[PDB]
Design a protein around this ligand. Structure first.
Ligand SMILES: [Zn+2]
Lengths: 207, 84, 125, 48, 149, 50, 118
RNA sequence: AAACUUUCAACAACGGAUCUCUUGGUUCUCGCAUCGAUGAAGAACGCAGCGAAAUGCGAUACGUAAUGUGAAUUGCAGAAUUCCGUGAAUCAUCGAAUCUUUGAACGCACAUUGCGCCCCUUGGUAUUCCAGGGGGCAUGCCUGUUUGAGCGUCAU
RNA sequence: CGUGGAGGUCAGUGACGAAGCCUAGACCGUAAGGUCGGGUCGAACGGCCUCUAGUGCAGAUCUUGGUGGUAGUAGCAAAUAUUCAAAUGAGAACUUUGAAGACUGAAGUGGGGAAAGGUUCCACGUCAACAGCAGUUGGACGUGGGUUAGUCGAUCCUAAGAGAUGGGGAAGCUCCGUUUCAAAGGCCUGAUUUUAUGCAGGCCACCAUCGAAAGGGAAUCCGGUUAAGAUUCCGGAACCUGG
RNA sequence: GUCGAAUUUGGGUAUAGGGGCGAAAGACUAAUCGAACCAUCUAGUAGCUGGUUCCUGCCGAAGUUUCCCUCAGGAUAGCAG
RNA sequence: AUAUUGGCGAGAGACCGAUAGCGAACAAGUACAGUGAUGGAAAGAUGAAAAGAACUUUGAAAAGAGAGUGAAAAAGUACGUGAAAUUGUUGAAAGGGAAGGGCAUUUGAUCAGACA
RNA sequence: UUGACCUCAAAUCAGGUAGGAGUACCCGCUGAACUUAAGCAUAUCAAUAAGCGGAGGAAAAGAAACCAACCGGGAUUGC
């Protein structure tokens, strides 16, 4: 608050007295009358360069650079040395640009979907997630950031019919559409590689 | 002496209680309170006294009536019998 | 997770709204499940708690002890059970403050306006 | 007697009540003692 | 001060300029608001579009001379030639300008066709208390777009 | 003073009825932060300026 | 301890007679309270008086309402308490007034409804 | 040589740092438009079975009526099945009322709990005196009613 | 190297004890610093790749808080002066009573009051704090009681003065002025009860209001009484005003 | 020193800040006066004093030219990275 | 369409985390000072549950020591952990008008490592 | 004599209204200096703060005695 520290009438006393020259409250009948003020050093005083609201919170990036990076991150999915470095448990996967049938876009329940992701070999990443739920360190967990998981597979579709609602609840799993692919889902923490599960009707739409 | 003696001759007030703010501010040789000109219709307030405009302004007191208007607007200023 | 704009995921608001909660919200916050026979008999899982109900403890140092409720102290968020008391060192007794979540109902103090409650929930007679 | 406290508890309450009233006095004196003797217009009766 | 080989630059921050800063964090929220307003208007006028029919006019300068654009509204002569009335026109989704005089025929014959097409292309319902409802299309400045000659 | 007004007397009466301790049963409540009465006043220390 | 659902029935005189005895009850309780620490009956009496007086006034108010019924000016206590502005403002009739020109225009060229399709 | 002084450790003290916590702030965003002469905001005083406060409230005084909920309040005492009910409760809701003395503050005045006037009514032997109860008495301005003024002016 | 927070990761440590803290106990690093053991303690915290800052103190007559040496030191020395015995009590230079001695010495260390203070008055109980020693005492602490007016005073009048109205100024908050350049008002007979007025039947030309507990002013005394009130109460004896 | 008067004094009342009042000293104006007090503009400006927080490594100066109401300061070339 | 550090209701944060963040996390525009305008603070945490130390004994009494509650009084309302300055007791050591430090070693104390 | 008109008044006449609070935003008046200019007086700070008046949920503005000099546009507001 801009008026922090300046909610106070305070002017120095000066030389002569055996005190400093910092501004000093005036009056009497309390402990503040005489105390320092109007300062970065002073208790009850302001800060140095109060954090202002105007400040580059958000940052421009050029469209083709965003697209370059997104294509690179899509490509790194297909490389299992990076997928596995990044964290994902894919050692028992058949093949890495993991494609399944487009009948996955149409299942509605969650018991029916996790049964599929266990079948095509993602069971270990889901386990990895729900075994990693630890508590946050520090003063974030009373800023609505209590918990931390590890991230999981990314299911990619072409036309949502219930799949997104289904996998809304499983931990770690994210969903996306081939159009409106997100770099924050493909390269989290700037770490290339992400175990993606494509549908054939998405994989075709990519070209 | 301008001090410790002349604090001894201090036994007649230049101030007493205002009937509109209830504090010792009513100058009596002239009849005007120094925190809200009482005979005056307007309450004393200046935009350099932004602290003073917290010690007296709305929300300070009971708000006997004004506490209920947001309750009454929400219901649409309805009237009559409560219900069955 | 959540989907609405009207409900908060905020710790602070959700805690204030518990500790400053009135004695009408503290009726349904102090709810307690039913024993399996009663879930069968009345087709419910849980109900709010009322004096003169008969109960069982499934979690705590005083597990397994039954009792009837002596008083619902819905300012401490607690219930006080008969036959569940510590002999204070002088020889007096004091009942232990429970929490209803840690309980299970064995027998129900019925009444009109609980029979109705059950029938709206989808229960039985 | 009816409203809770009996005589020995009145005594034991008064004592601690007084004590917590005196603790704050010790604190107020400490926290005022520095800038109580701070005179705005002390004349310093000395030039020669 | 003046120090080195650097441009002279004028920067107008001698006034109490911090009292007056408008940082548009709203830019994502009031877009949503604008969309929602468009949407509820679309239901409060349920078959009608949100916008009116506007004409094409030469943009005025030596610079924008070659570029036509949507203007404010049609003129009384253009309407009269379109077999219409300046007061029924506004009831249907047509704009009208009483100030714009037209001295060019290439534009007259254009903003007349825009009104011949419109009446042929719309469906006007009778005036009553249960008037029928068919459909809702929103951009008459996109189904009757403005192409250059 | 002795030849006083009524406004003054009424305020003095209030200040009298305020010049009591804290009732001990206050301290036994279930969520209590009140240990003593801090708005206490006696004619030696603090004068009430009326 | 009494209840207004059984006091609406009674008459103004019965209610006054039911009041000037509650007052004696309260009088004697304020004496017994001096020879006894706690008299909690003196609350239920003090609220009972009010349960009577509310009823009295809500009987003497309806009688005036259905006296000034069908009259252009009724008292201010019985009139609405909306806000000052919503009483100083216009009525739905005064605001729905239009020149003959405007209404002639409106029944001639009203805002039609239409849609853009072949 | 001990005392003494100094250094280090253990335990104890003074003191309240660090670590963890947080019904609090701060900032951003979305929605709404709602004070007052029908007496506001604000102030003084008073009110609970035992409270000085804070919160609530006004001689109907931590509250009444009404509506919903459907058995508590709980610090103590008191109540208690009215508890298969016109019904607990510092509950919630709130559309009926109360709303002391004041305050733009409105009978005059107010460093006063000061002084009046009109109407109705009661009592005292009382249209006149005293007292009690109830209701009114401000200013500016508008529309209208009533009365009145001015050789301003007309007709007779 | 290090600190607060953010995104990824170790399917990281942990109530079989996280963090923090003490440790002339250990290891590594040139070093910033990191790691380990022990004791204490009780709930969250880290390594790595990166992001980001309110990011690192010996200092500023720095800010706040706290604590020392000097120091059991200077020093508690004006106001003529205290002493004996007893009672009380855990305890008496200091309380109570008694005896003695002495002071103020009637322009007082007496008896009342105005301002001002506000319950300090009186009693019962009491000693942690206050009474710069003590304390069984107290203007302290706790609980309670207590201030009675036709005659005292305020109230009423006006002084110096303050201040509305009408009016005039001023952008305006507000200013001038106080009877001014205002249509500024009640009060009485007939009319005898319609009491509304025909006349009456005329009366200055006034015209706010505030302002003195010491000025002006309607009227009171004795005795008695209480833990603490009294020209107020009780008893007796009187007076003034309005009816 | 003066002590019956240009005396002392309570209360009421008037005068309020570039204004008051002044037997006049630049004295008094709430311990404040060669221009009171309070808050705000105000984080007033300062070529001037003081301080400016972790390690190691590599390189490493200047106090001289020209102009400036310039001489406790800047620009400029140089030195240096 | 636009404005909105005010009011009413909602949602959130790469924000502060009790000397910070609003002056106010608490009976804060509170206490308190000043004639007055105005100025203006400090102060959060026992524990899961008061089970808040029955009882015995010394004492004039506070309090103490035993007991006891507790998972833990190394949590006893002066209560989370409980740093430092500063201080007491114990133990070791030294010490002619300062102390402390650097190089090197003796003596003492402690640690080391088994290379079984 | 009477009834009209005009003008001006009075009334505790009937019915009404305005005053004050708040004030972040809004509409107008009024109106500074510190400061910058390495001095300072024009200037700037600033058509700002302070002071005053007045409204709302938005206000104000607004459907041209406009822009322009085009092959001419077409209320206002805002980006
Ligand atoms: Zn006042």
């Amino acid at each position: 608050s801009e008026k922090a520290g300046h909610q106070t009438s305070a002017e120095s006393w000066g030389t002569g007295r055996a005190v400093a020259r910092i501004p000093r409250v005036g009056g009497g009948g309390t402990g503040r009358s005489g105390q320092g003020a109007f300062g970065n050093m002073c208790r009850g005083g302001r800060m140095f360069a109060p954090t202002k609201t105007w400040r580059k919170w958000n940052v421009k990036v050029n469209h083709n650079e965003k697209r370059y990076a997104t294509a690179s991150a899509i490509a790194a999915t297909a490389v299992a040395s990076l997928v596995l470095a990044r964290g994902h448990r894919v050692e028992k996967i058949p093949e890495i640009p993991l494609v399944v049938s487009t009948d996955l876009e149409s299942i509605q329940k969650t018991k029916e979907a996790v049964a599929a992701l266990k079948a095509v070999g993602a069971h270990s990443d889901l386990l990895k997630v729900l075994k990693s739920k630890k508590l946050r360190a520090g003063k974030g967990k009373y800023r609505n950031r209590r918990w931390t998981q590890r991230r999981g597979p990314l299911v990619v579709y072409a036309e949502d019919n219930g799949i997104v609602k289904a996998l809304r609840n499983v931990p770690g799993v994210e969903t996306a559409n081939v159009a409106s692919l997100n770099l924050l889902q493909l390269a989290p923490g700037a770490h290339l590689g992400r175990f993606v599960i494509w549908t054939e009707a998405a994989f075709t739409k990519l070209d | 002496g301008k001090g410790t003696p002349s604090f001894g001759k201090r036994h007649n007030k230049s101030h007493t209680l205002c009937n509109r703010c209830g504090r010792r501010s009513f100058h009596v040789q002239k009849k005007t309170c120094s925190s809200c000109g009482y005979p005056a219709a307007k309450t004393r307030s200046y935009n350099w006294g932004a602290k003073a405009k917290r010690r007296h302004t709305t929300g300070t007191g009971r708000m006997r009536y004004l506490k209920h208007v947001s309750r009454r607007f929400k219901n649409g200023f309805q009237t009559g019998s409560a219900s069955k | 997770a959540k989907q609405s704009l009207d409900v908060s995921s905020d710790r602070r608001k959700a805690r204030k709204a518990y500790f400053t909660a009135p004695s009408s919200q503290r009726r349904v916050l102090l709810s307690a499940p039913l024993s399996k026979e009663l879930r069968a008999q009345y087709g419910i899982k849980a109900l709010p708690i009322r004096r003169d109900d008969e109960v069982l403890v499934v979690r705590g140092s005083k597990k397994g002890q039954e009792g009837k409720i002596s008083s619902v102290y819905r300012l401490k968020f607690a219930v006080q059970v008969d036959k569940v008391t510590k002999e204070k060192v002088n020889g007096a007794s004091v009942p232990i403050n429970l929490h209803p979540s840690k309980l299970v109902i064995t027998k129900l103090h019925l009444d009109k306006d609980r029979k109705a409650l059950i029938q709206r929930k989808g229960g039985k007679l | 007697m009816v409203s809770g406290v009996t005589e020995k508890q009145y005594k034991k309450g008064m004592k601690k009540m007084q004590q917590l009233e005196k603790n704050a006095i010790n604190t107020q004196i400490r926290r005022e003692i520095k800038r109580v003797n701070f005179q705005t217009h002390y004349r310093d009766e000395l030039l020669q | 001060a003046i120090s080195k080989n650097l441009p002279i630059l004028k920067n107008h921050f001698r006034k109490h300029w911090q009292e007056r800063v408008k940082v548009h964090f709203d830019q994502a929220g009031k877009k949503v608001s604008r969309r929602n307003a468009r949407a509820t208007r679309a239901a409060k006028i349920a078959p009608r579009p949100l916008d009116l029919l506007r004409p094409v006019v030469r943009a005025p300068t030596v610079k924008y001379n070659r570029k036509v654009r949507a203007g404010r509204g049609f003129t009384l002569a253009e309407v009269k030639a379109a077999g219409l009335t300046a007061a029924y026109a506004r009831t249907i989704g047509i704009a009208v300008d009483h100030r714009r005089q037209n001295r060019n025929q290439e534009i007259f014959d254009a903003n007349v066709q825009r009104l011949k097409e419109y009446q042929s292309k719309i469906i006007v319902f009778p005036r009553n208390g249960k008037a029928p409802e068919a459909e809702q299309v929103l951009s008459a400045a996109a189904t009757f777009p403005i192409a250059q000659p | 003073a002795a030849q006083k007004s009524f406004r003054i007397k009424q305020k003095m009466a209030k200040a009298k009825k305020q010049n009591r301790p804290l009732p001990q049963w206050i301290r036994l409540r279930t969520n209590n932060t009140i240990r003593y009465n801090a708005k206490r006043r006696n004619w030696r220390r603090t004068k009430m300026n009326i | 301890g009494v209840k207004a659902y059984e006091l609406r029935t009674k008459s103004k005189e019965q209610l006054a007679s039911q009041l000037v005895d509650l007052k004696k009850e309260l009088a004697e309780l304020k004496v017994q309270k001096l020879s006894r620490p706690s008299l909690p009956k003196i609350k239920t009496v003090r609220k009972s008086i009010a349960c009577v007086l509310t009823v009295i006034n809500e009987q003497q108010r309806e009688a005036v309402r259905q006296l000034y019924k069908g009259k252009k000016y009724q008292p201010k206590d019985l009139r609405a308490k909306k806000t000052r502005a919503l009483r100083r403002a216009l009525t739905k009739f005064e605001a729905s007034q239009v020149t003959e020109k405007q209404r002639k225009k409106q029944i001639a060229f009203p805002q039609r409804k239409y849609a853009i399709k072949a």
